Design an enzyme around this catalytic site. Structure first.
Site: not given
Ligand SMILES: CCCCNC(=O)c1ccc(SC2CCCCC2)c(S(N)(=O)=O)c1
Ligand SMILES: [Zn+2]
Ligand SMILES: CCCCNC(=O)c1ccc(SC2CCCCC2)c(S(N)(=O)=O)c1
Ligand SMILES: [Zn+2]
Lengths: 240, 240
Positions: B77, B100, B49, B182
């Site tokens: 991203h 991020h 992702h 996400t």
């Molecule tokens: C299109 C596919 C999704 C892309 N996003 C991520 O991988 C992603 C992966 C992790 C995170 S943060 C969060 C994840 C679960 C609990 C711990 C922190 C975030 S975010 N943008 O800061 O909310 C994004």
């Molecule tokens: Zn993010």
């Protein structure tokens, strides 16, 4: 004697309106469910520290979009003959008394989870000043201090409009993050302090500061904590 | 079918600087311990992702006095050839990419206790744009993507100055309350989006969007959520 009371971000504080940062983001306080019917009754209690009213479920409060709270209890702070007893001050001025309505974030199920956590507890606070008229809302509580003057004494009282105890304009307040003003002095409490004051008769203010007994053989009086340094925190205002 | 992903106060959002509330309470960010030694190495992973860098213990970030955080991880991203992929937009403009940096409130020992709790998680976000020079800090990550092209692969990279992936201007930023973007899209997240952007080369931006593979026989591209409505929230700014 609790090291937490020597943290950096304690309450209460001296408010300086000209130094308050205005932020449009601070919208009018929303208080729903505060108009309580006469039944059921509520517990009023002299704990030798303050007088405390226990509040029912259903009193919902929001500080902003998605930032919601439920009311737990309310208590008062007061002084003595010729001496003011508010906790907060304004430009060094101590007001006669001070009401605190204590709430728990809807994101926590228990107060013990919320202690120490950012925004876990929120308190609404208002200053009580001398006026000419006799306050109806406050009389419902002040009238019963007689019964519970002992220390540990408690009584039941009919439901009342809790919101009538608070000032006129819910769009005019100061706001900061601090602590409980009693041990355990836990940090992360959001304090909201109305800009306007509520008025009690000099009779009512004498009552409040002269009817209850505290530790042992001694009057419950001057139950406020000294002023604590802001240490870099900036108080916010909801109005320019 | 994860419920908070249908909440009223989600991220990302479109930012309109004309409509931001100026809040003098918003001070410059304090970052401590972000200038890392080369050893121990850090884990860089293609999770299918995004590309995520797991950060070590000891990176402290404060959004202000008493607003204290520890960094957990960062990820990116991005879009695709001729297509922008930032999550946040400004006046409807989408930037080539976005970083991020996700943080945990010091009041909580683990993410799962912070989720949905007010100010429990805090994200630092910056837009990435095209500049004329190879970005040094970015090259250390981007030079290793080839090793993690496959979905679910990882590699070890030397420690670096994490704060050099961010803008040098820490005084100027927008801040609002929203959600993870996400699943489980939990609310209560404080989002801070820098005014200044970060410069990468065209080659760097191409490496980012053209190297990694995700689910299926599929390229990992355009990995941004659609903008979500403010729904009555106000965005603050740290600057007039
Ligand atoms: C299109 C596919 C999704 C892309 N996003 C991520 O991988 C992603 C992966 C992790 C995170 S943060 C969060 C994840 C679960 C609990 C711990 C922190 C975030 S975010 N943008 O800061 O909310 C994004
Ligand atoms: Zn993010
Ligand atoms: C020496 C005089 C002490 C009087 N204070 C209180 O009774 C009191 C009692 C309770 C509270 S709040 C309560 C909520 C969670 C558990 C302990 C404190 C507060 S406050 N000012 O809201 O912090 C005050
Ligand atoms: Zn109190």
């Amino acid at each position: 004697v609790s090291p937490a009371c020597a943290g950096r971000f304690q309450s209460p504080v001296d408010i300086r309106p000209q130094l308050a940062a205005f932020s449009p983001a601070l919208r009018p306080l929303e208080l729903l469910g505060f108009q309580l019917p006469p039944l059921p009754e509520l517990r009023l209690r002299n704990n030798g520290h303050s007088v405390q009213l226990t509040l029912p479920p259903g009193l919902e409060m929001a500080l902003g979009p998605g930032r919601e709270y439920r009311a737990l209890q309310l208590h008062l702070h007061w002084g003595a003959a010729g001496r003011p007893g508010s906790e907060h001050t304004v430009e060094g001025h101590r007001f006669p008394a001070e009401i605190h309505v204590v709430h728990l974030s809807t994101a926590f199920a228990r107060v013990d989870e919320a202690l120490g956590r950012p925004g876990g507890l929120a308190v609404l606070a208002a200053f009580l000043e001398e006026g000419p008229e006799e306050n109806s809302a406050y009389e419902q509580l002040l009238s019963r201090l007689e019964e519970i003057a002992e220390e540990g004494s408690e009584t039941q009282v009919p439901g009342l409009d809790i919101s009538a105890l608070l000032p006129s304009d819910f769009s005019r307040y100061f706001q900061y993050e601090g602590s409980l003003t009693t041990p355990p002095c836990a940090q992360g409490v959001i304090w909201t302090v109305f800009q306007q004051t509520v008025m009690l008769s000099a009779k009512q203010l004498h009552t409040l500061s002269d009817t209850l007994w505290g530790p042992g053989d001694s009057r419950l009086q001057l139950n406020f904590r000294a002023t604590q340094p802001l240490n870099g925190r900036v108080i916010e205002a909801s109005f320019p």
